[PDB]
Design an enzyme around this catalytic site. Structure first.
Site, short mmCIF file in Angstrom:
data_model
loop_
_atom_site.label_atom_id
_atom_site.label_comp_id
_atom_site.label_asym_id
_atom_site.label_seq_id
_atom_site.Cartn_x
_atom_site.Cartn_y
_atom_site.Cartn_z
N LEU A 260 0.84 -1.18 0.00
CA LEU A 260 0.00 0.00 0.00
C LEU A 260 0.88 1.23 0.00
CD1 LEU A 260 -2.67 -1.20 2.57
CD2 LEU A 260 -3.06 -0.59 0.14
N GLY A 261 2.07 1.08 0.59
CA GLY A 261 3.05 2.14 0.69
C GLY A 261 3.87 1.94 1.95
N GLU A 262 4.66 2.94 2.34
CA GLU A 262 5.43 2.77 3.56
C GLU A 262 5.39 4.05 4.38
OE1 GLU A 262 10.02 3.59 2.53
OE2 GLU A 262 9.24 1.67 1.75
N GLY A 263 5.34 3.86 5.71
CA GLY A 263 5.50 4.92 6.68
C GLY A 263 6.94 4.99 7.18
N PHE B 298 8.28 3.84 10.31
CA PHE B 298 8.80 2.72 11.07
C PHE B 298 8.59 1.40 10.34
CE2 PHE B 298 7.36 5.69 14.55
CZ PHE B 298 8.58 6.33 14.56
N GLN C 230 6.37 -0.65 6.62
CA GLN C 230 5.64 -0.65 5.36
C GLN C 230 4.28 -1.30 5.59
OE1 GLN C 230 7.02 -3.91 2.65
NE2 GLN C 230 8.64 -4.22 4.14
N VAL C 231 3.32 -1.02 4.71
CA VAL C 231 1.98 -1.53 4.91
C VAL C 231 1.61 -2.39 3.71
CG1 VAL C 231 -0.49 -1.01 5.34
CG2 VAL C 231 1.26 0.32 6.52
N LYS D 49 1.06 -3.77 9.02
CA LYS D 49 2.25 -2.97 9.17
C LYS D 49 3.36 -3.89 9.65
CE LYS D 49 3.80 1.57 10.44
NZ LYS D 49 2.58 2.37 10.74
N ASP E 67 1.37 14.17 14.59
CA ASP E 67 1.61 14.00 13.17
C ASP E 67 0.32 14.21 12.40
OD1 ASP E 67 3.02 13.63 10.87
OD2 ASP E 67 3.57 11.52 11.30
N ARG F 236 -2.67 13.47 5.25
CA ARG F 236 -2.12 12.21 4.77
C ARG F 236 -2.20 11.15 5.87
NH1 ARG F 236 2.16 15.67 6.15
NH2 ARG F 236 3.17 14.74 7.99
N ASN F 237 -2.58 11.56 7.10
CA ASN F 237 -2.56 10.66 8.24
C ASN F 237 -3.97 10.38 8.74
OD1 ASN F 237 0.70 11.64 9.39
ND2 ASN F 237 0.08 9.85 8.25
N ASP G 88 -1.53 6.60 12.17
CA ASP G 88 -0.14 6.98 12.33
C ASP G 88 0.14 7.50 13.74
OD1 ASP G 88 2.44 6.86 11.71
OD2 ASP G 88 2.32 8.12 9.92
C1 LIG Z 1 0.86 7.59 6.34
C2 LIG Z 1 1.07 6.64 7.50
N1 LIG Z 1 0.05 5.57 7.58
S1 LIG Z 1 0.72 3.97 7.43
O1 LIG Z 1 -0.15 3.11 8.22
O2 LIG Z 1 2.16 4.02 7.62
C3 LIG Z 1 0.44 3.65 5.70
C4 LIG Z 1 1.36 4.13 4.78
C5 LIG Z 1 1.18 3.90 3.42
C6 LIG Z 1 0.08 3.19 2.99
C7 LIG Z 1 -0.83 2.70 3.92
C8 LIG Z 1 -0.66 2.93 5.27
N2 LIG Z 1 -1.57 2.42 6.20
C9 LIG Z 1 -2.91 2.08 5.97
N3 LIG Z 1 -3.50 2.25 4.78
C10 LIG Z 1 -4.77 1.88 4.65
N4 LIG Z 1 -5.47 2.03 3.45
C11 LIG Z 1 -4.92 2.54 2.26
C12 LIG Z 1 -5.51 2.21 1.05
C13 LIG Z 1 -5.03 2.67 -0.16
C14 LIG Z 1 -3.91 3.47 -0.14
N5 LIG Z 1 -3.43 3.91 -1.36
C15 LIG Z 1 -4.13 3.53 -2.57
C16 LIG Z 1 -4.08 4.65 -3.61
C17 LIG Z 1 -2.66 5.15 -3.89
N6 LIG Z 1 -2.21 4.96 -5.31
C18 LIG Z 1 -1.46 3.67 -5.49
C19 LIG Z 1 -0.76 3.54 -6.81
N7 LIG Z 1 0.10 4.73 -7.04
C20 LIG Z 1 0.92 4.50 -8.25
C21 LIG Z 1 -0.71 5.98 -7.10
C22 LIG Z 1 -1.49 6.19 -5.81
C23 LIG Z 1 -1.64 4.70 -2.85
C24 LIG Z 1 -2.22 4.71 -1.45
C25 LIG Z 1 -3.32 3.80 1.08
O3 LIG Z 1 -2.20 4.61 1.12
C26 LIG Z 1 -2.57 5.72 1.94
C27 LIG Z 1 -3.81 3.34 2.28
N8 LIG Z 1 -5.51 1.37 5.64
C28 LIG Z 1 -4.91 1.22 6.81
C29 LIG Z 1 -3.60 1.56 7.04
C30 LIG Z 1 -3.01 1.32 8.38
C31 LIG Z 1 -2.93 2.57 9.20
C32 LIG Z 1 -2.22 2.30 10.48
C33 LIG Z 1 -1.48 1.15 10.72
C34 LIG Z 1 -0.87 0.98 11.95
O4 LIG Z 1 -0.14 -0.18 12.17
C35 LIG Z 1 0.59 -0.07 13.40
C36 LIG Z 1 -0.99 1.95 12.93
C37 LIG Z 1 -1.73 3.08 12.67
O5 LIG Z 1 -1.91 4.08 13.60
C38 LIG Z 1 -0.98 3.81 14.63
C39 LIG Z 1 -2.35 3.26 11.46
#
Ligand SMILES: CCNS(=O)(=O)c1ccccc1Nc1nc(Nc2ccc(N3CCC(N4CCN(C)CC4)CC3)c(OC)c2)ncc1CCc1cc(OC)cc(OC)c1
Length: 288
Positions: free
Chosen positions: A19-22, A24, A26-27, A49, A150, A154-155, A168
């Protein structure tokens, strides 16, 4: 250390699309069978995560600490909820509610009006709702004696149901003792969202989150505009020290700009609490 109540079985988890990375970790998307303690044989889509590929010892302790920050806080509709954790015999996986519609910044950006030349919408009321939802979650958060540190579009993440869920807890801090936190250390910081006292003096409070919520308001009403675009940290400092404030977005009503500016008082104690922000946004949600 073990925690059987949160422990989840490895063989029931199939890791899926990243999904991407934070900061600490990656998700990834994942399938977790019977996460829905209830019934039970059905696979629920969750986020997982885990450590990044280049992960330090500190990333690990931070990810655990983030996991704990979540166990503490308790459940709330406007907060991403912990679901479980594989902590035994294999890498740390932290299992968490999946937000299908991504983060709020891109959510808002995705539904900007295209051209007439280029190729539902969202209403002013939709935007105030998001503000409110985040206000409510931060209200709950604060009362659990915890600070986000934070808070930014984006969060915040959006469910299939358009429900705002704060996420986050990377920089989140248990504050039960003192009711504030002092940094004194050096690390990577979300500077363009940060209150002067927090930036310049390293003091954090529910009141520095309030300043940040200010910035999230600006982000909402510009539909994911970037604060201080391109302006380097050198210069943010300068602008803040002079008491510059961001301009009112076109889409912003005067009422909402006042709530915004209110979050940006120099003196922390002159900012509203999240309690008040909820009230104020309820009202505004009401008159719409
Ligand atoms: C920022 C920090 N948040 S994170 O968690 O590090 C994190 C970083 C990056 C990505 C996802 C996350 N996390 C989560 N993401 C989701 N759904 C989601 C759906 C789609 C996208 N997309 C889809 C569209 C998009 N396209 C892809 C292709 N590209 C080419 C163009 C763009 C890319 C992003 C998405 O990205 C946001 C996210 N659901 C839940 C979480 C868990 C949250 C969490 C976990 C935790 O575990 C301890 C503790 C927490 O609070 C303590 C909170």
């Amino acid at each position: 250390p073990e925690d059987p109540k949160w422990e989840f079985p490895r063989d029931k988890l199939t890791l899926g699309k990243p999904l991407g990375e934070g900061c600490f970790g990656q998700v990834v998307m994942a399938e977790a069978i019977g996460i829905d303690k209830d019934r039970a044989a059905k696979p629920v889509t969750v986020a997982v995560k885990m450590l990044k590929d280049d992960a330090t010892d500190k990333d690990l302790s931070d990810l655990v600490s983030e996991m704990e920050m979540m166990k503490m806080i308790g459940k709330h509709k406007n907060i991403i909820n912990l679901l479980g954790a594989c902590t035994q015999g294999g890498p740390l996986y932290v299992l968490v509610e999946y937000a299908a519609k991504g983060n709020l910044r891109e959510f808002l950006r995705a539904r900007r009006p295209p051209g007439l030349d280029y190729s539902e919408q969202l209403t002013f009321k939709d935007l105030v709702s998001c503000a409110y939802q985040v206000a409510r979650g931060m209200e709950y958060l604060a009362s659990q004696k915890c600070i986000h540190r934070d808070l930014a579009a984006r969060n915040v993440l959006v469910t299939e149901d358009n429900v705002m869920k704060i996420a986050d807890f990377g920089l989140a801090r248990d504050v039960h003792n003192l009711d504030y936190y002092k940094k004194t250390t050096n690390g990577r910081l979300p500077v363009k969202w940060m209150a002067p006292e927090a930036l310049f003096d390293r003091v954090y409070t529910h009141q520095s989150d309030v300043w940040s919520f200010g910035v999230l308001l600006w982000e909402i009403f510009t539909l994911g505009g970037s604060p201080y675009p391109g302006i380097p940290v050198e210069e943010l400092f300068k602008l803040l020290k002079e008491g510059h404030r961001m301009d009112k977005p076109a889409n912003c009503t005067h009422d909402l700009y006042m709530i915004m500016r209110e979050c940006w008082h120099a003196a922390p104690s002159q900012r509203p609490t999240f309690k008040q922000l909820v009230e104020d946004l309820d009202r505004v949600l009401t008159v719409t």
